[PDB]
Symmetry: C2
Subunit: 326 residues, 2 copies
């Protein structure tokens, strides 16, 4: 009956109608295709690659409603002029984040690189880049009419588009600057606290979802289904609002290294293990990344909030119709 409860909860709350999901993503795909050709002509100065889609909607892991997706804005930084410094090596002492430093100004003076205009204190400021990308940025009415969409950028949060693709269907697109030095991929979404605002955030998302997709392909497994049910519960339960998709994804990755068997009838059991696992990580104040275990995925939560989450989850064990209500 937990199985049946879980599959009912998925079909009735976690699942997005197949057409809504397809259309929402296609609208994102259309807008991306059009910006690429547009920005091509207009920005001959900027070391940027083409913007590209990212997020659960793109990878079929969005739940409840298809309402949001990112446009990654990938800067180009040359190796001999920049380095990334992991946060645990900075005085910030926070793994999972990075400082981006302008190297060798003696060899290659300031102004050699376009992004020198975005340097603060010798570091590439994630916020100065975001503001720079924003100020430079496009005829949205023109692009809208070309696709028969209604696209309306937001007032400050000006790096988000509101996209009316169907009559009463909208989705949100936000731009996300990004950088790659070596194998390390970074993203301009600020640490929650202002004093960490010069740090870029390590992005784990593409390797995490590829890991999870590859596992499920190899044996027709139910890891992704379990994830989405978990995402849907947290998304629909305001006391669980602080939990993020990346935390839930890594709960499932640890359990996958513990459990080889994820056949459909294992769903109920795997979900219980994930739920008890989340509770345990919450008790330890630490949820390490399965891909990069030095990273504590609870790093931005306060101990109080961490306490509140475990408490909510502990209560839910004896009131199961408050995780599973629709």
């Amino acid at each position: 009956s937990l199985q049946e409860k879980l599959l009912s909860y998925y079909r009735n709350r976690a699942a997005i109608p197949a057409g809504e999901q397809a259309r929402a993503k296609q609208a994102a795909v259309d807008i991306c295709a059009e910006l690429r050709s547009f920005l091509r002509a207009k920005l001959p100065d900027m070391p940027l690659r083409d913007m590209y889609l990212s997020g659960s909607l793109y990878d079929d892991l969005q739940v409840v409603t298809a309402d949001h997706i990112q446009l990654i804005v990938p800067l180009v930084l040359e190796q001999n002029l920049w380095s990334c410094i992991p946060g645990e090596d900075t005085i910030m002492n926070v793994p999972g984040f990075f400082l981006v430093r302008r190297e060798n100004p003696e060899y290659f003076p300031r102004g050699s690189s376009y992004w020198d205009r975005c340097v603060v204190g010798g570091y590439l400021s994630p916020k100065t880049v975001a503001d720079t990308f924003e100020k430079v940025v496009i005829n949205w009415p023109a692009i809208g009419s070309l696709l028969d969409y209604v696209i309306r950028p937001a007032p400050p949060e000006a790096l988000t588009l509101e996209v009316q693709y169907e009559k009463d269907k909208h989705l949100v697109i936000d731009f996300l600057p990004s950088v790659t030095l070596g194998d390390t991929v970074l993203v301009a979404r600020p640490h929650r606290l202002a004093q960490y605002d010069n740090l870029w955030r390590l992005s784990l998302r593409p390797a995490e979802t590829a890991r999870l997709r590859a596992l499920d392909q190899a044996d027709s497994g139910c890891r992704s289904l379990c994830l989405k049910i978990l995402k849907a519960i947290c998304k629909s339960t305001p006391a669980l609002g602080h939990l993020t998709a990346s935390q839930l994804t890594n709960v499932i990755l640890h359990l996958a290294q513990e459990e080889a068997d994820w056949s459909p009838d294992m769903l109920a059991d795997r979900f219980l293990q994930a739920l008890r696992g989340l509770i345990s990580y919450l008790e330890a104040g630490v949820l390490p990344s399965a891909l990069n275990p030095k990273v504590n995925l609870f790093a931005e939560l306060t101990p109080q909030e961490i306490d509140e989450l475990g408490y909510t989850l502990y209560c839910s064990l004896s009131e199961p119709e408050v995780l599973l209500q629709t």
Copy 2:
């Protein structure tokens, strides 16, 4: 009628069948998409924007068969470290071509740009840039892996060119074309036919000419592009006329379009006759001015024998143009 013969020739010879056209473009788009992923994953620090598709196949100006497209390779050049010098202001006096000069070498020493490695005698060499792309990028691509991945037979052919088999008996030729944008000026690494002018980049005329061709036809539903495509199909089909380029033929039409306002469907046979007559006059004069850049002689790379073959061939058909229409 000559009118009937032209209209029928377009449908029977010039127009590419729908299926062949869609498969060729799909193959192009698949490959461009796959290369954007490879550049992201493997060369994220290379000062290039993303490669993108370009040419008549993209602009629906290709004829007879879809056998060719370009992947533009856009260098990122710092606007404060580089300038372009029009060929006619050089000792070489070669309009339609530019030198790309390294600026401020006292303050920003060699190395400050990645592209300094391609500077010869103070100028960014198009050949050295092409050499750099070929071994850093093109030579790092696993073409069999992409082939099995996309399900095409792909074969590198002559230095920067792919052959992609998209049907049993049809292949698409993709050539990589290094390009530079300085301010409003787009330059392309397509060498002047003569070796002594080989440090010169070629001014990119195609996008502006095409945009002008299309805008004119859009305003009155005219037969300019139809006429052009008929002319391209003739030259492509006729060995003695293979020396003409689509840029030359488009400029004949642009010059004709300035003399003639009426290009209704019934006017096709007249305009076509006027375009042949014009071609002859330009070839006799040894000059075909670019419509958008009047200092540039689009016949400047034709040899004497070549111009003599074109002129004689076209004159012979003036008495019976039908002989061109198969």
